[PDB]
Design a protein around this motif. Sequence first.
Motif, PDB file in Angstrom:
ATOM      1  N   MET A   1       0.869  -1.164   0.000  1.00  0.00           N
ATOM      2  CA  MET A   1       0.000   0.000   0.000  1.00  0.00           C
ATOM      3  C   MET A   1       0.904   1.211   0.000  1.00  0.00           C
ATOM      4  O   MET A   1       0.672   2.182  -0.725  1.00  0.00           O
ATOM      5  CB  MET A   1      -0.902   0.010   1.233  1.00  0.00           C
ATOM      6  CG  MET A   1      -2.283  -0.569   0.985  1.00  0.00           C
ATOM      7  SD  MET A   1      -3.252   0.452  -0.154  1.00  0.00           S
ATOM      8  CE  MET A   1      -3.207   2.024   0.703  1.00  0.00           C
ATOM      9  N   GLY A   2       1.952   1.135   0.816  1.00  0.00           N
ATOM     10  CA  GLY A   2       3.030   2.104   0.769  1.00  0.00           C
ATOM     11  C   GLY A   2       3.880   1.829  -0.458  1.00  0.00           C
ATOM     12  O   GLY A   2       5.082   1.544  -0.355  1.00  0.00           O
ATOM     13  N   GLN A   3       3.248   1.922  -1.628  1.00  0.00           N
ATOM     14  CA  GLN A   3       3.876   1.507  -2.870  1.00  0.00           C
ATOM     15  C   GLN A   3       3.036   1.914  -4.093  1.00  0.00           C
ATOM     16  O   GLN A   3       3.563   2.066  -5.195  1.00  0.00           O
ATOM     17  CB  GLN A   3       4.107  -0.007  -2.839  1.00  0.00           C
ATOM     18  CG  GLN A   3       5.192  -0.508  -3.761  1.00  0.00           C
ATOM     19  CD  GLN A   3       4.637  -1.282  -4.938  1.00  0.00           C
ATOM     20  OE1 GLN A   3       4.809  -2.500  -5.033  1.00  0.00           O
ATOM     21  NE2 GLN A   3       3.970  -0.581  -5.847  1.00  0.00           N
ATOM     22  N   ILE A   4       1.734   2.100  -3.897  1.00  0.00           N
ATOM     23  CA  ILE A   4       0.851   2.472  -4.999  1.00  0.00           C
ATOM     24  C   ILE A   4      -0.003   3.674  -4.638  1.00  0.00           C
ATOM     25  O   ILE A   4      -0.922   4.037  -5.375  1.00  0.00           O
ATOM     26  CB  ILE A   4      -0.091   1.312  -5.402  1.00  0.00           C
ATOM     27  CG1 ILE A   4      -0.923   0.841  -4.206  1.00  0.00           C
ATOM     28  CG2 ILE A   4       0.702   0.151  -5.966  1.00  0.00           C
ATOM     29  CD1 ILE A   4      -1.778  -0.381  -4.499  1.00  0.00           C
ATOM     30  N   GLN A   5       0.315   4.285  -3.501  1.00  0.00           N
ATOM     31  CA  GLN A   5      -0.499   5.351  -2.919  1.00  0.00           C
ATOM     32  C   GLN A   5      -0.637   6.611  -3.794  1.00  0.00           C
ATOM     33  O   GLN A   5      -1.728   6.922  -4.302  1.00  0.00           O
ATOM     34  CB  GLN A   5       0.060   5.700  -1.536  1.00  0.00           C
ATOM     35  CG  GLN A   5      -0.329   7.063  -1.013  1.00  0.00           C
ATOM     36  CD  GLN A   5       0.693   7.609  -0.043  1.00  0.00           C
ATOM     37  OE1 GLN A   5       1.054   6.942   0.929  1.00  0.00           O
ATOM     38  NE2 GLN A   5       1.179   8.821  -0.311  1.00  0.00           N
ATOM     39  N   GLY A   6       0.475   7.321  -3.975  1.00  0.00           N
ATOM     40  CA  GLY A   6       0.492   8.552  -4.743  1.00  0.00           C
ATOM     41  C   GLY A   6      -0.042   8.332  -6.141  1.00  0.00           C
ATOM     42  O   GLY A   6      -0.570   9.246  -6.771  1.00  0.00           O
ATOM     43  N   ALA A   7       0.099   7.097  -6.614  1.00  0.00           N
ATOM     44  CA  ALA A   7      -0.429   6.685  -7.903  1.00  0.00           C
ATOM     45  C   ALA A   7      -1.933   6.956  -7.986  1.00  0.00           C
ATOM     46  O   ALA A   7      -2.366   7.884  -8.679  1.00  0.00           O
ATOM     47  CB  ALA A   7      -0.125   5.212  -8.138  1.00  0.00           C
ATOM     48  N   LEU A   8      -2.716   6.158  -7.261  1.00  0.00           N
ATOM     49  CA  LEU A   8      -4.169   6.310  -7.219  1.00  0.00           C
ATOM     50  C   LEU A   8      -4.559   7.722  -6.807  1.00  0.00           C
ATOM     51  O   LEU A   8      -5.614   8.227  -7.205  1.00  0.00           O
ATOM     52  CB  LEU A   8      -4.770   5.318  -6.227  1.00  0.00           C
ATOM     53  CG  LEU A   8      -4.503   3.840  -6.489  1.00  0.00           C
ATOM     54  CD1 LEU A   8      -4.693   3.056  -5.205  1.00  0.00           C
ATOM     55  CD2 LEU A   8      -5.416   3.312  -7.588  1.00  0.00           C
ATOM     56  N   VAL A   9      -3.702   8.350  -6.006  1.00  0.00           N
ATOM     57  CA  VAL A   9      -3.950   9.712  -5.540  1.00  0.00           C
ATOM     58  C   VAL A   9      -3.987  10.741  -6.672  1.00  0.00           C
ATOM     59  O   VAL A   9      -5.020  11.366  -6.919  1.00  0.00           O
ATOM     60  CB  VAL A   9      -2.923  10.139  -4.478  1.00  0.00           C
ATOM     61  CG1 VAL A   9      -2.952  11.647  -4.282  1.00  0.00           C
ATOM     62  CG2 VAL A   9      -3.210   9.427  -3.171  1.00  0.00           C
ATOM     63  N   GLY A  10      -2.858  10.926  -7.346  1.00  0.00           N
ATOM     64  CA  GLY A  10      -2.803  11.840  -8.468  1.00  0.00           C
ATOM     65  C   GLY A  10      -3.834  11.429  -9.495  1.00  0.00           C
ATOM     66  O   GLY A  10      -4.516  12.276 -10.066  1.00  0.00           O
ATOM     67  N   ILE A  11      -3.943  10.118  -9.711  1.00  0.00           N
ATOM     68  CA  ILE A  11      -4.966   9.545 -10.576  1.00  0.00           C
ATOM     69  C   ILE A  11      -6.322  10.184 -10.307  1.00  0.00           C
ATOM     70  O   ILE A  11      -6.969  10.680 -11.224  1.00  0.00           O
ATOM     71  CB  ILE A  11      -5.074   8.023 -10.370  1.00  0.00           C
ATOM     72  CG1 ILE A  11      -4.023   7.289 -11.200  1.00  0.00           C
ATOM     73  CG2 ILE A  11      -6.460   7.522 -10.734  1.00  0.00           C
ATOM     74  CD1 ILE A  11      -3.964   5.806 -10.902  1.00  0.00           C
ATOM     75  N   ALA A  12      -6.727  10.189  -9.038  1.00  0.00           N
ATOM     76  CA  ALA A  12      -7.989  10.794  -8.623  1.00  0.00           C
ATOM     77  C   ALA A  12      -7.968  12.305  -8.830  1.00  0.00           C
ATOM     78  O   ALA A  12      -9.002  12.916  -9.117  1.00  0.00           O
ATOM     79  CB  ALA A  12      -8.270  10.472  -7.177  1.00  0.00           C
ATOM     80  N   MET A  13      -6.787  12.900  -8.680  1.00  0.00           N
ATOM     81  CA  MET A  13      -6.620  14.340  -8.858  1.00  0.00           C
ATOM     82  C   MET A  13      -6.356  14.734 -10.315  1.00  0.00           C
ATOM     83  O   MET A  13      -6.044  15.895 -10.606  1.00  0.00           O
ATOM     84  CB  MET A  13      -5.506  14.870  -7.954  1.00  0.00           C
ATOM     85  CG  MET A  13      -5.996  15.902  -6.955  1.00  0.00           C
ATOM     86  SD  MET A  13      -6.960  17.223  -7.722  1.00  0.00           S
ATOM     87  CE  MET A  13      -8.534  17.072  -6.857  1.00  0.00           C
ATOM     88  N   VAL A  14      -6.471  13.768 -11.224  1.00  0.00           N
ATOM     89  CA  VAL A  14      -6.326  14.058 -12.645  1.00  0.00           C
ATOM     90  C   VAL A  14      -7.523  13.590 -13.463  1.00  0.00           C
ATOM     91  O   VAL A  14      -7.849  14.189 -14.483  1.00  0.00           O
ATOM     92  CB  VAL A  14      -5.034  13.458 -13.251  1.00  0.00           C
ATOM     93  CG1 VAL A  14      -3.809  13.998 -12.546  1.00  0.00           C
ATOM     94  CG2 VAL A  14      -5.058  11.941 -13.198  1.00  0.00           C
TER      95      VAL A  14
END
Lengths: 50, 50, 50, 84, 50
Positions: free
Chosen positions: C35-48
């Motif tokens: 989870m500490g491995q794909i976090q910022g991914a889904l995050v920016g994803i949601a913010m894009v």
Amino acid sequence: LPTGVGYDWTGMSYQERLSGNQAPSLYAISLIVVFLCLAALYESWSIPFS
Amino acid sequence: MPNFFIDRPIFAWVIAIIIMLAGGLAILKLPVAQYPTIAPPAVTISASYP
Amino acid sequence: AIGLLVDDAIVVVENVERVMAEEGLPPKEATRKSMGQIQGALVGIAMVLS
Amino acid sequence: DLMDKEGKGLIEATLDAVRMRLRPILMTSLAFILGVMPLVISTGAGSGAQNAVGTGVMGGMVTATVLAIFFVPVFFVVVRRRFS
Amino acid sequence: AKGDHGEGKKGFFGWFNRMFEKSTHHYTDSVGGILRSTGRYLVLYLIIVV
């Protein structure tokens, strides 16, 4: 046409509708917002172009 | 919130960039008048016995 | 909006899966560092995607 | 996160990545492309809408999955190299 | 149990996992082989844009 006759568009011709007016401007600033957030996530300027 | 804004340069950039985009739109969409609307409302009935 | 949900859920599951298949961890630790491995991914994803 | 965390020059980074992502991409896609077959299938009572939404989605999905799955590993290495 | 890509288990799922790592090995190959060729599928991509 003879002096004194004017014209006007009402109804469906007042408005004018959708794609071809300014809807790709929406796609556009949506894209600008996207490359922005991608320059936020990659902290590059190239890398989002991938 | 500084040393992380200090480390990732474009993050803040993008934030400002955004703030300007907004305030720049909200200039175009904003109607320019003299001051604010100041007076109480005055309603007014008006007849004529000729 | 059925496709962009399952994408998030599957991302979350499959990366932990892979991590465990490959590293031999206990499930909760596998995910505690996956989870500490794909976090910022889904995050920016949601913010894009927005 | 293979380059700025490990130290891999892109030529090996990219491939390890596309292999580490090769299953999820394929699942999300194979689930979605089926999921929107309900739309493209229904005849009568609400089709028009269902169809016109569905097919754009399905087609658009099958191409950008089978293509970008090859191009994106290259999208990076073309953009990564030229500028650094 | 670390490394197990569900090969030696039952009937169809095993052959599926096997045929899968088979297919993604052949894939990593294929795209490593389109990696040595930066400038060809660029011609293809731009044609696509057109």
